[PDB]
């Protein structure tokens, strides 16, 4: 049906925008602390602490399968990355401090993207 095609065109456009948003967000992580999942090999207890791990590559996998239906969903995953890090790691660490900076820098990008998604539909 043509209604379905048009829904699909709207999903695809959302995806193109969310990719741009992701690249922007990832540029606020020049160190690549958040680029890949935490290794269970190198932090074996991680899943006793963090119930829903998240990272940029995993977000990128989901994105290219158009698995984000809206910006809320993508914002949830982004917030997991930050929030997982600020729980697992202590306040005086390079990891925690990179989360804070990503949150603050990310908040700007996400402030405008919320307008571009409303405004463009």
From Swiss-Prot:
Organs and tissues of expression: Highly expressed in testis.
Disulfide bonding pattern of the chain: none
Cross-link (Glycyl lysine isopeptide (Lys-Gly) (interchain with G-Cter in SUMO2)): 41
Domain of life: Eukaryota
All copies of domain Bromo, residue ranges: 9-113
Subcellular location: Nucleus; Chromosome
Protein purpose: Scaffold subunit of various histone acetyltransferase (HAT) complexes, such as the MOZ/MORF and HBO1 complexes, that acts as a regulator of hematopoiesis. Plays a key role in HBO1 complex by directing KAT7/HBO1 specificity towards histone H3 'Lys-14' acetylation (H3K14ac), thereby promoting erythroid differentiation.
Subunit structure: Component of some HBO1 complex composed of KAT7/HBO1, MEAF6, ING4 and BRD1/BRPF2. Component of the MOZ/MORF complex composed at least of ING5, KAT6A, KAT6B, MEAF6 and one of BRPF1, BRD1/BRPF2 and BRPF3. Interacts (via PHD-type zinc finger domain) with unmodified histone H3. Interacts (via PWWP domain) with dimethylated and trimethylated 'Lys-79' on histone H3.
Name this polypeptide is given: Bromodomain-containing protein 1
Source species: Homo sapiens
Residues of the full protein shown: 555 to 674 of 1058
């Amino acid at each position: 049906s043509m209604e379905q095609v048009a829904m699909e065109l709207r999903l695809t456009e959302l995806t193109r925008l969310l990719r741009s948003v992701l690249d922007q967000l990832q540029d606020k992580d020049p160190a690549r602390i958040f680029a890949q999942p935490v290794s269970l090999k190198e932090v074996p207890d991680y899943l006793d602490h963090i119930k829903h791990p998240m990272d940029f590559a995993t977000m990128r996998k989901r994105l290219e399968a158009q698995g984000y239906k809206n910006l809320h969903e993508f914002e949830e995953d982004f917030d997991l990355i930050i929030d997982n890090c600020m729980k697992y790691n202590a306040r005086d660490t390079v990891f925690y401090r990179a989360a804070v900076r990503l949150r603050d820098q990310g908040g700007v990008v996400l402030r405008q993207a919320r307008r571009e998604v409303d405004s463009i539909g």
